Each structure stands twice: as structure tokens, then as C-alpha cells.
Amino acid sequence: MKILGISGGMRNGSNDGMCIEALMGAKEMGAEVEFIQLQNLHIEHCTDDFDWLLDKMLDADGIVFSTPIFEKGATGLFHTITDRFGPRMDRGNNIIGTKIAEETGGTAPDPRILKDKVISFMSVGGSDWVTRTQCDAGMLALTPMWKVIDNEVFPWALSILVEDERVARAHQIGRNIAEAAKDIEHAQYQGDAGVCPHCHSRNFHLQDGKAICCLCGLEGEIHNEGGKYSFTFPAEQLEHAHDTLSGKFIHGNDIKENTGKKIANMQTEKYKARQAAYRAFITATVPE
Ligand SMILES: Cc1cc2nc3c(=O)[nH]c(=O)nc-3n(C[C@H](O)[C@H](O)[C@H](O)COP(=O)(O)O)c2cc1C
Ligand SMILES: O=c1cc(-c2ccc(O)cc2)oc2cc(O)cc(O)c12
């Protein structure tokens, strides 16, 4: 099995070391290993080296991804790579687009795109402003539905490479990801159990009568039993979870419906007139 490790830090920084230490654990379990430093890549925002990167991810059986924490989440570059997964890696649309290709004599999209795959994440921050990065990491695996094995957070980690026990945790994440790639089907999540019995997430959006898992998006309720929190929801909701084929199909169907309504609305006079007034009112300032 091939384990691919990706670092989002500075060249030769702590994320490099944590991600390389994990590759070592993966080689210890008999995996072939490869390492990509994102600072060498040119990746444009979602309106260039991206297709190369995605191609490498497709050939790997498992991936370890180490990102720095910026403002209690992953880097803008991580977010960009998440943005740029949608058009290409959504398990839903690729199942659909494959079927349609078969049934209309289309050409069969890249098979690797639909292969099950395992992925692990480590978030390395310099202080404890780290409340959002795990959920960021999950988001990236949610679009292709890659089975997440570990999704660890490492606060107060400026000097982590001389803290042997945390370096060792990263070696164990390397182990886990290789063992899991040995049998992607029966691989099982190894990380924190968290609060969402489904997502494992600990991030929730809270309004009156509705708590929503920020990762998987079940709407449910959050219960405080003497300072311990838990998340319950109605078993209908599993049908809609954003990390299930069922919920993706629902989500994609509603997108196609509302994109048709949009295309029709853009031919009304209401739309055209309102747009024509906006252009008349003001023009965008650009740098000379
Ligand atoms: C713009 C910026 C924002 C950051 N925000 C956070 C943060 O919110 N919480 C945190 O622990 N660390 C934060 N850090 C520190 C980084 O996580 C740290 O520099 C990084 O893990 C270094 O990794 P490297 O050695 O791989 O480059 C931030 C750093 C920068 C440059
Ligand atoms: O090492 C750090 C560097 C920075 C940073 C980023 C930009 C600046 O002008 C000054 C500091 O923010 C941080 C925020 C944190 O929560 C933790 C850090 O280690 C850092």
C-alpha cells in the first residue's frame, strides 16, 4: 500500500516533521511512502498545480495531511483545496456522472475518482486557538467521503519536534493510516469519539429548537448532563447527513432544481432590469 503525506507548513517546519514522522510509522507497517510539500505547489483560488496534486492523491491508498492552524482553523490554502475538490471529487456527482456516461455512450470518467480511500489529519497550532480546525479537516474528506482514521489537534506546538511523546503520537497516526489502508473496507475510525455520534464532531450551530452538527449536518439537540454534552437526533435524519450517499443525492437534486429556477429567473424582466440598474449605479475599482 502507498501512503501519501502532505504538509501545509513552511518548508522544514513542524508540520513537515509531524507528517514525515507519520510516514515513518507507515513504512514501519510496510507501506510505500511519498511526501508533498504544498509550499512548492502553485494553487489558485476557486473562482494550477492542483490537478497534479489531485492526481497524486488518487493513486494513494491512504493520505496523511498535516496543516498549520490559522485563526483557529486550517490555512486559507487548505480551504482553497477544499473548494477545489467540489467540482471533481464529490462522490455523489461522480457516481451519477459515471452512470450517465455508461448509459449515453459517454466516456467513462477516471475510475480512481470512485475508489474508497482513507485519510488522516493533524492540525498543529502555536497556542490553544484551535477550536475550528478539526471540522475544517473533516470538510475535505466529506466531499469524496474518504474514511477518516485520525483527525488530531496539537495546540502549543511551536516546539513540538522536541516533545517526544507528541512526536510519537504522530508516529502512531502513521501506523494507523497504513494498517487502515491494508483493508480499506474494514478500517475503522481511531480518533476522538466527540459529541456527534455520527460526525464525531464537537462543533455545533445552535438556535432555538435546533442544534446542527457543523461537519455532518444532522439537526438534533444538544444535552448538558452535569457539564457533559451529547447530541441526539431523529433517525430519519441519517437519510440527509452530508457524508452519506443518500444525503448527497438529496443535496445534489435540490441544486439542480434551484439552478433551473435561477436560469429561468434570469430571463425575466425583473431580473434583467434590476441587473441593468446595478451596472448603471457603480463600476468596480481596480488597481491600475
Ligand atoms: C496568520 C497566522 C495565524 C495563526 N493562527 C493560529 C491560531 O489561531 N491558533 C494557533 O495555535 N496557532 C496559530 N498560528 C501559528 C501556526 O499554527 C504555526 O506557526 C504553525 O503551526 C507553524 O508550522 P510550520 O512549522 O509547519 O510552519 C498562526 C500563524 C499564522 C502565521
Ligand atoms: O507564531 C505565531 C505567529 C503569529 C503571527 C502572525 C502574524 C503576525 O504579524 C504576528 C504573529 O500568530 C500566532 C498566533 C497563535 O495563536 C499562535 C502562534 O504561534 C502564532
What Å resolution does this PDB entry report?
Answer: 2.6
Closest CA to 153 of 127, 174, 188: 127
Q: What single-letter amino acid sits at 251?
A: H
Closest CA to 206 of 193, 224, 189: 224
User: 3.40.50.360, 3.30.70.3270, 3.40.50.2300, 1.10.3720.10: which CATH number matches 2-181?
Assistant: 3.40.50.360
Cell of 117: 480511500
Structure obtained using? X-ray
Closest-approaching ligand to the CA atom of 155: 1
Per the document, the length of the chain is: 288
The DSSP line for 19-56 is HHHHHHHHHHTT-EEEEEEGGGS--------HHHHHHH
Task: Classify burial at 129, counting beta carbons within 10 Å of its beta carbon; exposed 0-12, middle 13-18, buried 19 or more.
Answer: middle
Q: Is the CB of 154 under 6 A from ligand 1?
A: no
The Å distance, Cα 13 to ligand 2 centre, comes to 15
The Å distance, Cα 172 to ligand 1 centre, comes to 23
Q: What single-letter amino acid sits at 263?
A: I
β-partners of residue 124 are: 68, 154
Closest CA to 127 of 169, 204, 70, 78: 70
Q: Is the CB of 155 under 6 A from ligand 2?
A: no
The Å distance, Cα 68 to ligand 1 centre, comes to 5
Closest-approaching ligand to the CA atom of 38: 1
Q: Tell me phi and psi for residue 32, to 5 degrees.
A: -80, 145
Q: Are 150 and 190 in contact (CB under 8 A)?
A: yes
- Give me Rg for the CA atoms of the chain: 21
The residue whose grid cell reads 516546539 is: 159
Q: What single-letter amino acid sits at 148?
A: V
Rounded Cα distance between 62 and 33, Å, is 10
Q: Is the CB of 10 under 6 A from ligand 1?
A: yes
Q: Where are the domains of the chain?
A: 2-181, 204-239, 245-281
The Å distance, Cα 91 to ligand 2 centre, comes to 36
| C-alpha dist (Å) from residue 66 to 12, 55, 86, 133, 276 | 13, 19, 21, 11, 47
Q: Are 117 and 61 in contact (CB under 8 A)?
A: yes
Q: Is the CB of 100 under 6 A from ligand 2?
A: no
The DSSP line for 188-238 is ---S---SSTTT----EEEETTEEEETTT--EEEEEEETTEEEEE--TTGG
